[PDB]
Amino acid sequence: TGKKEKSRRIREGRVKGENFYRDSKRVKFLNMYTSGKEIRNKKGNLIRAASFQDSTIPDAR
Amino acid sequence: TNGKNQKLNKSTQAVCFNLLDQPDSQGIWATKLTRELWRRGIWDDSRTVEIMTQAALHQDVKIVMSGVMFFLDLNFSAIHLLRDPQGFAEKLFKEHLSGKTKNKFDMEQKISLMQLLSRLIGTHKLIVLGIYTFFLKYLTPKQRDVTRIMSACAQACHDLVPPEVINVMVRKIADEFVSDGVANEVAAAGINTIREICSRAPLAIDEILLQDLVEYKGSKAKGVNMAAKSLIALYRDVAPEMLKKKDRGKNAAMEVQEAKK
Amino acid sequence: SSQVREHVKELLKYSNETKKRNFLETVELQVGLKNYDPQRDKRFSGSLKLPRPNMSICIFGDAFDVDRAKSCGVDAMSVDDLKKLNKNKKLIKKLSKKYNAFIASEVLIKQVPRLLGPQLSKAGKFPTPVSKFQLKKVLCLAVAVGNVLVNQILMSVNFFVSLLSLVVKSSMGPAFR
RNA sequence: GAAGACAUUGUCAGGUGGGGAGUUUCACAUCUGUUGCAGAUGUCUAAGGGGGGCUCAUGGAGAACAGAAAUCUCCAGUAGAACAAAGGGUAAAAGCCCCCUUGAUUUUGAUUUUUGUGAAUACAAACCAUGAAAGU
RNA sequence: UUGACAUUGUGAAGAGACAUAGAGGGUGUAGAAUAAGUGGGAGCUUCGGCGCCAGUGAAAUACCACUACCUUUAUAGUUUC
RNA sequence: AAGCUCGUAUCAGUUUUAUGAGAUUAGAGGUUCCGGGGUCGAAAUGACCUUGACCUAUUCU
Numbered sequence: 001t002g003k004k005e006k007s008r009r010i011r012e013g014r015v016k017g018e019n020f021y022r023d024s025k026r027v028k029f030l031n032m033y034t035s036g037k038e039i040r041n042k043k044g045n046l047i048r049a050a051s052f053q054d055s056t057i058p059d060a061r
Numbered sequence: 062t063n064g065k066n067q068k069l070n071k072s073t074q075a076v077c078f079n080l081l082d083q084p085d086s087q088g089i090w091a092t093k094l095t096r097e098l099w100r101r102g103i104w105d106d107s108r109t110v111e112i113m114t115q116a117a118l119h120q121d122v123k124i125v126m127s128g129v130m131f132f133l134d135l136n137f138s139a140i141h142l143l144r145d146p147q148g149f150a151e152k153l154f155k156e157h158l159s160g161k162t163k164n165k166f167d168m169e170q171k172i173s174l175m176q177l178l179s180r181l182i183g184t185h186k187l188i189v190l191g192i193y194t195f196f197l198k199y200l201t202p203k204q205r206d207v208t209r210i211m212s213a214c215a216q217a218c219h220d221l222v223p224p225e226v227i228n229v230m231v232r233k234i235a236d237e238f239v240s241d242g243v244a245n246e247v248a249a250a251g252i253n254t255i256r257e258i259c260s261r262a263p264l265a266i267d268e269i270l271l272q273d274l275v276e277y278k279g280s281k282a283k284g285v286n287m288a289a290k291s292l293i294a295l296y297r298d299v300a301p302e303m304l305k306k307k308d309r310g311k312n313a314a315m316e317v318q319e320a321k322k
Numbered sequence: 323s324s325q326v327r328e329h330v331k332e333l334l335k336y337s338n339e340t341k342k343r344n345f346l347e348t349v350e351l352q353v354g355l356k357n358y359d360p361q362r363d364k365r366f367s368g369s370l371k372l373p374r375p376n377m378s379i380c381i382f383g384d385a386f387d388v389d390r391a392k393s394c395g396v397d398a399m400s401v402d403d404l405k406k407l408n409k410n411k412k413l414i415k416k417l418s419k420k421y422n423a424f425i426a427s428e429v430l431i432k433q434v435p436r437l438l439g440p441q442l443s444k445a446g447k448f449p450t451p452v453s454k455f456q457l458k459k460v461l462c463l464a465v466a467v468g469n470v471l472v473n474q475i476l477m478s479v480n481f482f483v484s485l486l487s488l489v490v491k492s493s494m495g496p497a498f499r
Numbered sequence: 500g501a502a503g504a505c506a507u508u509g510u511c512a513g514g515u516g517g518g519g520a521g522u523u524u525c526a527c528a529u530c531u532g533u534u535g536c537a538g539a540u541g542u543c544u545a546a547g548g549g550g551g552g553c554u555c556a557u558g559g560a561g562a563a564c565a566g567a568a569a570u571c572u573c574c575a576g577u578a579g580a581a582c583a584a585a586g587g588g589u590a591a592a593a594g595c596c597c598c599c600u601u602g603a604u605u606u607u608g609a610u611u612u613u614u615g616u617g618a619a620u621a622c623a624a625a626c627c628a629u630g631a632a633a634g635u
Numbered sequence: 636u637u638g639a640c641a642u643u644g645u646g647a648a649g650a651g652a653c654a655u656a657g658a659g660g661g662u663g664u665a666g667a668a669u670a671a672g673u674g675g676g677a678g679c680u681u682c683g684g685c686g687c688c689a690g691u692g693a694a695a696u697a698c699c700a701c702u703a704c705c706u707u708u709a710u711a712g713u714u715u716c
Numbered sequence: 717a718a719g720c721u722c723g724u725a726u727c728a729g730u731u732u733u734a735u736g737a738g739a740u741u742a743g744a745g746g747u748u749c750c751g752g753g754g755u756c757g758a759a760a761u762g763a764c765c766u767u768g769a770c771c772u773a774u775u776c777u
Contacts (some may be wrong), residue, residue: 001514002515003515064705065705075662078663107663111664114663115663116627137538138361145694147440147693148440151440164749164750166750172530186444188439188440188443190435190436190439199635203742203748203750203770205750208529209529209530212530221435221443221664222435223433223435224432241568245527246527246528249527250529253529253541253542257541261704278583279583281583281584282527283543284527284528285508285527286528286543287526287585288543290542290544291541292584309543310546311546314546344678345677347675349675350675350700353701354702376676384689390686408647412691444693450703459672459673460671460703461673461702461703462701462702462703463673463674464673464700464701465674465675470685487701489700491674491699492675492700493675493676494679494698494699494700495699496699497701504643504644504645509640509641509642509644511638511639512638512639513636513637514636514637516692
């Protein structure tokens with residue numbers, strides 16, 4: 001019971017992967033090594049382009 | 062823990078007293094310790110507040126500041142264990158700020174002394190009358206961090222002081238903050254620190270300048286408008302006859318119409 | 323109730339058991355109740371009252387007031403019956419302490435703090451214009467109600483609970499709860 | 500021999516337990532912290548009615564101290580002023596001042612926005628305010 | 636793993652607490668003195684010692700009531716260890 | 717797809733006619749009485765010394 005994230009957050013004071021290790025800030029940094037990736041549906045076509053690959057021509061004024 | 066060992070506390074308060082006598086710096090280890098024990102709730106006693114009073118009345122700056130920051134921490138319950146708050150404030154204002162004009166404290170410490178004096182005064186209905194001319198040197202918008210000084214000016218106002226010595230203050234502020242050409246923040250600060258004076262001392266500015274200040278209702282700047290509306294709503298419930306018919310808002314005017322006959 | 327009446331009756335008989343200490347025994351009520359903490363500012367104040375305090379008041383005034391209140395049997399004072407007193411703190415404190423209360427004209431309650439400033443404001447007897455039961459720091463609170471009139475006791479008690487054991491007493495008499 | 504009403508054994512109740520199982524992946528701005536912040540104080544969240552009188556902004560000329568701006572007088576001035584910043588509407592006013600009031604009141608139904616309300620809208624009876632009145 | 640109950644019987648000696656009945660207390664400094672504090676005030680008097688009027692002190696002491704804390708005395712019983 | 721009130725004349729991817737809708741003070745100097753140095757000062761709200769920020773006169777709309 002003491003080894004639960006609930007009890008830890010209570011005794012101390014969100015993102016997937018916050019443990020006794022690896023706070024908020026650290027999880028985002030470590031996810032960089034993986035999820036520069038390209039999302040697709042089951043038939044195959046772009047839902048969400050990869051990071052820094054948005055492919056929209058902005059209004060450059 | 063179980064019971065308070067008075068034989069020990071009364072003994073180790075005597076060493077704090079006998080340290081604060083040594084005028085070099087050695088009362089640091091009395092002040093820094095008594096603050097900790099007060100915060101831990103171990104030394105809630107009248108004998109201890111005297112130690113920090115003597116520290117505030119000391120000559121060393123880092124001891125006087127320890128005492129002042131203790132009595133600050135909006136103040137804490139230690140004020141309700143003092144032996145004479147009026148004489149305390151009088152001795153402080155006489156020794157540190159005005160008396161010798163030694164010019165030891167910097168502005169950041171003078172402001173913290175002012176805060177303590179005004180917050181004691183407003184809370185306990187004190188009368189010194191030198192405060193209100195000491196503020197006037199520092200009540201200029203060309204001065205260093207005046208928003209703290211003027212926020213303590215109001216805190217030393219009462220229902221029970223001669224409003225002329227506050228009229229001079231209000232007419233200094235009005236001459237130097239809501240005059241011709243002044244900026245929006247400056248004028249809004251002036252009006253905001255005048256209305257929270259008048260919330261304690263209502264008959265400290267007369268109708269003729271009240272009207273001059275409610276001029277600024279529709280001021281297009283959104284600081285001065287929010288400020289003037291506060292003064293109007295303050296005198297709508299207190300002395301609505303000073304306001305003109307245009308400002309008496311549907312109930313002050315009705316109360317005056319029934320009570321004027 | 324008339325359980326007050328049986329108390330006050332043989333208090334008035336105690337009136338005639340240890341008769342006189344060559345003065346008059348005032349009547350007092352001591353309030354005792356719980357459930358409140360005055361170290362927090364839970365303050366109360368009310369002055370909706372009417373006695374015989376062997377009336378000893380000091381009115382400050384002007385020419386228009388001193389010859390008004392030379393009748394009346396009252397101690398009176400000029401403005402410079404006060405101006406020539408500030409030089410001595412214990413002198414200005416002795417008059418402080420002399421009188422049960424203070425009053426003054428509508429003109430002089432702008433000038434009185436420049437003269438009698440530190441005193442007369444913490445003492446809780448500051449003057450009041452002409453033409454109390456403060457919960458300062460304690461749970462104990464006693465008030466003088468009358469003299470040697472059972473109505474006054476209840477009259478004050480309902481006001482005290484209005485504001486929020488009860489005891490009635492005289493100068494040397496016993497306590498009646 | 501040792502030990503002894505404790506240990507043990509039985510049932511409950513807390514703790515630990517990836518060793519193992521299953522599973523998922525509304526506002527300007529003084530007063531405390533993270534960085535130039537989310538938070539705490541206090542501080543705005545707003546005078547409508549119906550009668551009268553009068554014209555505003557700005558510019559020009561002119562008057563001791565008085566000047567670019569202090570008060571006074573005259574001329575021009577369709578709004579360039581104000582009415583909760585480049586826009587509509589308003590000039591014997593929808594604006595400023597003055598007089599009187601507080602219809603920002605109840606009852607009965609009708610319409611638009613909108614099936615839920617609220618909002619606005621007109622409509623009749625009463626108590627009322629206002630002006631000499633029409634009328635509101 | 637730690638606690639309670641049961642198994643679980645026969646004896647003894649001690650410590651703490653409930654609960655009542657009591658008993659007394661207060662040095663920051665000045666002040667005759669060690670001032671919880673508050674409110675009534677100028678003697679019940681064995682003494683007129685004294686209380687009032689006199690300093691000094693935020694607060695003034697006799698006399699009598701209130702209701703805060705602190706520390707101790709005893710065990711009808713109550714229990715725990 | 718199954719039908720049921722009845723068989724009017726109302727309708728129409730159409731036409732016609734009328735009619736509405738910001739930065740620059742170098743040049744002058746005054747202050748900071750919280751930034752004070754300087755020979756001096758038992759002692760001083762000073763001779764003056766600079767860092768300054770301050771109130772200023774300029775330019776565009």
